[PDB]
Amino acid sequence: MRNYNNFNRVWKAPRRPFEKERLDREMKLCGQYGLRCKREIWRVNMTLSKMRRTARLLLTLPENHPRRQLEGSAIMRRCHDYGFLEEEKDKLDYVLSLTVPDILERRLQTVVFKHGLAKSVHHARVLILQRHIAVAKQIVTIPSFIVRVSSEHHIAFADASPFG
């Protein structure tokens, strides 16, 4: 017996999957950003809902409450990192204005293309997985790696690369 390692789901399917409204706004993403399947669109959704739950709960509180103070700075800090929000943001209402694209946008697959190192998102997903990209000096072969605001300006190529 005697396993003390956690399991958790990171993705879940929204209720009523045959809504033609939802289908539109799925394909629109998965085609454009070159995503493999719908599973990816959902994976980000979950983590965003999570973040937005605590932010809502903090916002409710009166000023000068410990929950508000401490954990408010943290939520904000980690949206400054990854470039989801800028450093002119502080409210914890900005945090609730985050939506699904702004996450996907900062995945390595898109960041590679946008920085000029590929000709398509589909093409940049290959460039990742053929082990010919880096994220500063560290070879990353995962397209779902979220890239820091600092470290999207040091992408370069792998040192194992015939293209570098």
Binding site: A134, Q138, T141, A158, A160
Partner: protein, 123 residues
């Protein structure tokens, strides 16, 4: 051809353990342009020159951890003072990679079976 591959060995955090008369040093390796993993022989040579040990006998190393992407390795190794201290203090398997270990004990199962039958006998 266009280069000569080399193996670079460094260390980070070092101890002096006078209780067991050994050194405990977290190794690092880099090995730019080297093909595949670094064999431990090379590492022992570099460490010899570094800590001014006259032996690769006293240098006995275990474990190596190859980080993802490119040639990189990190590890940990032990130097001992004397060669007698090495043989005595160190585990069997570590030694036997140098070829200073002991011959393997006879199979566990045959021992059990016999150890049971010895309880029966009176002499």
């Amino acid at each position: 051809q266009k280069k000569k591959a080399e193996v670079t060995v460094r260390t980070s955090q070092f101890k002096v353990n006078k209780l067991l008369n050994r050194k405990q040093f977290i190794v690092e390796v880099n090995h730019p342009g080297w093909c595949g993993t670094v064999p431990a022989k090379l590492i022992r040579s570099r460490l010899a020159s570094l800590y001014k040990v006259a032996d690769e006998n006293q240098i006995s190393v275990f474990g190596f951890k190859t980080k993802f992407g490119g040639g990189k390795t990190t590890g940990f190794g032990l130097i001992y003072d004397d060669l007698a201290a090495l043989k005595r203090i160190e585990p069997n398997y570590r030694k036997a990679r140098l070829g200073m270990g002991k011959k393997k004990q006879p199979a566990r199962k045959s021992v059990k079976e016999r150890r049971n039958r010895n309880k029966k006998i009176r002499g």
